[PDB]
Amino acid sequence: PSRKAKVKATLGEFDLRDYRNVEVLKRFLSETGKILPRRRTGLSAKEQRILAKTIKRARILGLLPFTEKLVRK
């Protein structure tokens, strides 16, 4: 049931609403361009939602992937 690491936990203090912040953001996506859930990221419902929105915005621009590819298989 996945207990490797939490994305909020490995991290320090950061802003949610900056899409222009890709390094800290490419962390909440999957290896496939896909958003990690509550039980993989570790944020508040509200916070998670905000993050998701920001991710979407970024995608719309072109900062983060819409999707990519999983490898090795």
Binding site: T32, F66, L70, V71, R72, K73
Partner: protein
């Protein structure tokens, strides 16, 4: 008559037939194999063994164009995607990587009635 040594292997897989297309690293396909290519009509067309056979055939064809470098790309899921991959690994090519890639709609148009009930 083209000669390349280098490229990719798409395995597109429906549960009805696991198709394998070998292409150069552009995206121009030299040779391909599927179930019916290995005779196999109908039921068995998309069984794991069939898929494996197809993969082998594809590899053989590639070899007839001096081919070694092969990047795997699996599109969808059929009766034997994993088996096909295994065959490719074994077959006789320098495999790059097994790229897992579904042509999943980002909530597209309505699916068929068989693919209805998915809801």
């Amino acid at each position: 008559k083209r000669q390349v040594a280098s490229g990719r292997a798409y395995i597109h897989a429906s549960y009805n037939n696991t198709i394998v297309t070998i292409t150069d690293p552009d995206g121009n396909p030299i040779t391909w194999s599927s179930g019916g290519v290995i005779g196999y009509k109908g039921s068995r067309k998309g069984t794991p063994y069939a898929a494996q056979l197809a993969a082998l055939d594809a590899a053989k064809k590639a070899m007839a164009y001096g081919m070694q470098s092969v990047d795997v790309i699996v599109r969808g899921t059929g009766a034997g995607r994993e088996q096909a991959i295994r065959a490719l690994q074994a077959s006789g090519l320098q495999v790059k990587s097994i790229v897992d890639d579904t042509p999943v709609p980002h909530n597209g148009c309505r699916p068929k009635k068989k693919f209805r009930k998915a809801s």
